[PDB]
Amino acid sequence: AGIKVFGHPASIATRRVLIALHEKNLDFELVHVELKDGEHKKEPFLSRNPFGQVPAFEDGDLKLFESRAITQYIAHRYENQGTNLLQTDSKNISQYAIMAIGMQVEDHQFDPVASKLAFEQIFKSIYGLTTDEAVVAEEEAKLAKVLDVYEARLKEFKYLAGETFTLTDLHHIPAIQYLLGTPTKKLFTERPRVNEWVAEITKRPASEKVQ
Amino acid sequence: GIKVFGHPASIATRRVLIALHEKNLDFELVHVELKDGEHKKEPFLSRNPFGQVPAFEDGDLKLFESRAITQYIAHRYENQGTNLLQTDSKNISQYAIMAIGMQVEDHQFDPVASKLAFEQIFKSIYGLTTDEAVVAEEEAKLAKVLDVYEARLKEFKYLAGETFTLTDLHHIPAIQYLLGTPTKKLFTERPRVNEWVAEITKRPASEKVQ
Amino acid sequence: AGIKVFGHPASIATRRVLIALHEKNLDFELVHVELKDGEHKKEPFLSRNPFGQVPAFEDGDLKLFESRAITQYIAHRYENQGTNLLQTDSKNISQYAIMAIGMQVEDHQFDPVASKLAFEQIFKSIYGLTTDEAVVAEEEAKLAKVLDVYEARLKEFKYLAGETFTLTDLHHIPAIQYLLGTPTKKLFTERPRVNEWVAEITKRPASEKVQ
Amino acid sequence: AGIKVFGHPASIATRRVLIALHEKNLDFELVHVELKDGEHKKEPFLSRNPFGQVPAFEDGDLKLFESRAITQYIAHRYENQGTNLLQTDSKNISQYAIMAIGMQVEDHQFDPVASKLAFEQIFKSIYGLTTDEAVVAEEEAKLAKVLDVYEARLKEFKYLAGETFTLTDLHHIPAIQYLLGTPTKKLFTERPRVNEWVAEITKRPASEKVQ
Amino acid sequence: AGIKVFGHPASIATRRVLIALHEKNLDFELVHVELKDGEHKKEPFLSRNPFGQVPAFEDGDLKLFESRAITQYIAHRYENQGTNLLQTDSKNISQYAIMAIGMQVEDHQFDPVASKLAFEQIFKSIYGLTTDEAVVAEEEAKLAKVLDVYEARLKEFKYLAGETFTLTDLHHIPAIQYLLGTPTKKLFTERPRVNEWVAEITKRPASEKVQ
Amino acid sequence: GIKVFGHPASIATRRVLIALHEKNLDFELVHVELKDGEHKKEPFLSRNPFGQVPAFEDGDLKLFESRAITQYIAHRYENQGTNLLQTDSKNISQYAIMAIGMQVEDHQFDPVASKLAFEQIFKSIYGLVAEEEAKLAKVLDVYEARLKEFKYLAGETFTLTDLHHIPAIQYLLGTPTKKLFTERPRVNEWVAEITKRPASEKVQ
Ligand SMILES: C[C@@H]1O[C@@H](Oc2c(-c3ccc(O)c(O)c3)oc3cc(O)cc(O)c3c2=O)[C@H](O)[C@H](O)[C@H]1O
Ligand SMILES: C[C@@H]1O[C@@H](Oc2c(-c3ccc(O)c(O)c3)oc3cc(O)cc(O)c3c2=O)[C@H](O)[C@H](O)[C@H]1O
Ligand SMILES: C[C@@H]1O[C@@H](Oc2c(-c3ccc(O)c(O)c3)oc3cc(O)cc(O)c3c2=O)[C@H](O)[C@H](O)[C@H]1O
Ligand SMILES: C[C@@H]1O[C@@H](Oc2c(-c3ccc(O)c(O)c3)oc3cc(O)cc(O)c3c2=O)[C@H](O)[C@H](O)[C@H]1O
Ligand SMILES: C[C@@H]1O[C@@H](Oc2c(-c3ccc(O)c(O)c3)oc3cc(O)cc(O)c3c2=O)[C@H](O)[C@H](O)[C@H]1O
Ligand SMILES: C[C@@H]1O[C@@H](Oc2c(-c3ccc(O)c(O)c3)oc3cc(O)cc(O)c3c2=O)[C@H](O)[C@H](O)[C@H]1O
């Protein structure tokens, strides 16, 4: 009954879902999955996601996993409450496609790089493992290319899909929150439109709630 | 009209081509010469700054990312040819189920399938020897994905439900390649997966790009 | 305190030092080196270890690094307090050599394998990453060969250097603590003298203090 | 009947043969072998080359494989037509040996390095993959040494075997064509005699026919 | 000043040259290059071969390197003395091409595998290293394929290029001599026509002179 | 008496041999035929169950692990030949400083030096690096800084810390990796001194 998120409050992909829920002012329960104990690779969590990755999700009888499938469900199902996470005219197909390009680009070009950066520089550090400086340099060079594209794009429009905040922007927030606490920060601050964009999306109340 | 900027052997290009054929749409395939690095040069970079085929045009609308393109095609031309969305396309929960499968193809299937094709086909063109360790590690991963698919296909005829959708369509080009390799066994040894592969690969739109 | 340890409490090599200090009932400060902030790759930590790795160590004016150099120093400098970590007759050179063989074997044969097993099964799994089952199988086969040697050895003597607990046994403890929380546990439990040895050394109060 | 080449028009080794045929103004059929479908590792291609490598070749009843055995056959069999691919005085044994050194050097020192560089910088990109910048730097250093030797050699003579274009030069052309579309280009252009040599051999009509 | 070979008497490539010289009954000096002291990577040897590999070679004013360029030069320059190392009718271009296929095959398919097998099983011991049994198994499987092709070939003809002993056969001898002192021997003796071929070419006086 | 069970080319065997020569000790080198897998068979396995050269004997005492052996030699025969311990061997802090260097040689230097030697000697000789040279440079920069303060790695005298590096260095001096040593002036002098020692030249 109601909306439940099965995840961990430090997980990037879990935070994606949490931010979208807060943006919609939805009530929900966060059910804690203990990653340190391998609970995500055990039953019963495996029956909610056989790939053993947080988050999983429930809205009544509907059971989901994959953060970006979940956010998009939220954005459609609860379109008319709270922040609109779709384009202003959500019935405009070409505008939806432009948002979709940006979502694909986050998923394929931004996230794997940002993830590796956060893993090397933050998560390894929590367990006393040493950061591989070569992976960091290689991954920062990649991220700089992605951010150069974003810079050009943000010269044209206030946000990545157009003039309003959407899922394209939202999906970047958790990884960015973590990378702002690392030397990777410079890559965002040295690009002026990227920097303003980061400042706006991270100061949103929904973003600050999960931080 | 509709133009696709890509290469006819490319997995991601074939994704778009199959969707266009399924909609019976006319279009032009404008060849991008990957062997000459044309995808990492202007003017192709001005269509996709990440230098990856395919890019796409429908009148004034310019796109890239194969799965954004296919979805656009499926919505813009919803009412002609094959329906690539769910039967009731206005049902939001049903759309979310399709979306899970599309995410799963992208994150769990495609990177593994793409490594298996690289090691067993593409390395052989060129001078290179297939790393049998990568092949074994990747086949074990693929088996886990296909076990999930098997369970799912016991419940429903296709991956998103009772009808062929983008979730199935996105898998076709990688599968077409892997059927020419010993990885074939992973599909054939799983009966519902095997039937599913036979159905989706024998579709006329699939055969047109082969 | 006189004695300071510069490390991280989850680090295997740091725990080696901590256990030795506790065994000697020494007072000391653990100074937590902030790996996430790159503190280990900055002055003043680099003046304690130019290779930028944890732990480093101080006893008055004496500055050290390398966990096994530190534990040995502790064992000699504070020989006649708390547990004896050297051989019963510490002046016996041949007996010291037998302990030294075991310490070398821990360093070369045991530690790199145990480390990789912990990384693949614990560190990676907690994050998003999939445990490479091939590395696990290859490494477990190596570990089994080591533990077979240990089994034969523990049929002759209560501990690895002879009849008493020494640094040879102590140096294995932290890695073992981690591997007991993984399926690699079986390799220890399926060997009866190894199993009794693991049970004894991990139930020591000094071992439990760092867990 | 007549000359047939069994290969693929993008293949470096196939192009070697094609260029030699064009230089002799020979008529021939290119029979396409579908490498993407593994046709080279199946019968009937395996009966033409049991090592499953393109190209294979036929001139009437004579069946050959190995690109450099084929080019040499072409150069002798059809010596007196089109471009002379042997030395001016082809009966001069010491001059032949000098050409033979160069051909060996292309095969052993140039080709494996040039191949790797093309793979890392062009072919990996076609598939997902990322170019390993370390391999590129290691291989470019190797290529630079080769090209330094070539530079010295080209200060004495117009081409690599002497004053005329021969098989020694011809065998380099296909790999060079690919590397001119990569940043490795600089290694050629930064060496003035190498640069002029590359410009000459790539602007030959036979070279341009296969491009 | 006559024929000089600059190399080392244990080197496979040097032995190639020595055998050809002995087959021609030529007088020559072997000038020792001390590999263990890096003499091959220093002047004056580098001025004979800028790639720093034995052997180099001299016949009067003519300076050469690459063992197979040298053997071929010897076979042409001294064609009409001692053993003919070319085909019976050396003016027959198709017959030359058939010998050339076999020479290419020895270089590309046989030599790299045979050379690894000799390194793992014989020469690793010279430097105090242990034989990698996995490399050995992988390489023996490759060598078996090559030898199966050779077996088929030798059903048709007494030697690899036809009815008479040529450079194709000669180039295999040194590697084979070494592999006959290893368990790899079985691959040759398992195959009856290969076995008779090995027995014939290794019992030649010129072969025995370098052993 | 003293016996060493190993192979004369083996880096770890040479470590032991050098220490014996430095102490002017008589001993027998009993060859273990690695090419024939003798190290992975009985009776060698009963001297070292891990099947690695060298093993060692001094009367009834049986040892393996080169660095355990060198240290035993340095203590058992402390007062003869070269002192391989610190000048004041009873000084515990000074021993610890030598111990840091021995650990550093084992963990930071040896694995890198060993890879470089085995890739290049052989690439150069039998026709079969950049990542490893970068790692080695870092280690050698630390050594350079250290050798500005003291004549040797543990202090003012030659000790086991220096000795343990010798065999790998001997091999690397026959490769282009030589430059990493020569481009660092204090490292270069240190290498020249430790490799010209008679005990080092005896095993070369
Ligand atoms: C609000 C909806 O937005 C758009 O539908 C699309 C949707 C979509 C519709 C309903 C859902 O429950 C859902 O999760 C996604 O998805 C798209 C994804 C793409 O990658 C590209 C598209 O053009 C659409 C696409 O056009 C359309 O404008 C549609 O007419 C409208 O009902
Ligand atoms: C102006 C467009 O920018 C670039 O494409 C991107 C688009 C986009 C493409 C086509 C459109 O019609 C549109 O309005 C936006 O959107 C992006 C969104 C992101 O979040 C990130 C991106 O890199 C792009 C991104 O790279 C391409 O150069 C495109 O062909 C060009 O038309
Ligand atoms: C029947 C469902 O199977 C699994 O979810 C999947 C679904 C799915 C299906 C129907 C549902 O009502 C639903 O909530 C989820 O669909 C998939 C599609 C794919 O292409 C691949 C998948 O891995 C799943 C996939 O793993 C999950 O274990 C889910 O919790 C369970 O209810
Ligand atoms: C009885 C002895 O066992 C084995 O050596 C080991 C020794 C050792 C050698 C000589 C002795 O007198 C002694 O009491 C112990 O100690 C070990 C300690 C470990 O932690 C691990 C080991 O593998 C050995 C280890 O393998 C060897 O087979 C040795 O040569 C033999 O004499
Ligand atoms: C000038 C020559 O350079 C080197 O030999 C080569 C020769 C060559 C040897 C003897 C001659 O009389 C001659 O005119 C050229 O030719 C080459 C050609 C290539 O295409 C590549 C090479 O590396 C050499 C190559 O390395 C040798 O160091 C030789 O000592 C010297 O005479
Ligand atoms: C019987 C022949 O075998 C194969 O070619 C080889 C030839 C060869 C080709 C055409 C001829 O007319 C001829 O007399 C010999 O010779 C070889 C010699 C070697 O030392 C190694 C080889 O693999 C072949 C080798 O593979 C090819 O399959 C060829 O097409 C076929 O005609």
Ligand SMILES: C[C@@H]1O[C@@H](Oc2c(-c3ccc(O)c(O)c3)oc3cc(O)cc(O)c3c2=O)[C@H](O)[C@H](O)[C@H]1O
């Ligand atoms: C000669 C001895 O040296 C020093 O003992 C130490 C020894 C040691 C003593 C006797 C032996 O047979 C042996 O093989 C090693 O080892 C150490 C190792 C370290 O890593 C750190 C140390 O401080 C000592 C440490 O201080 C001490 O100065 C001891 O007082 C003295 O008897």
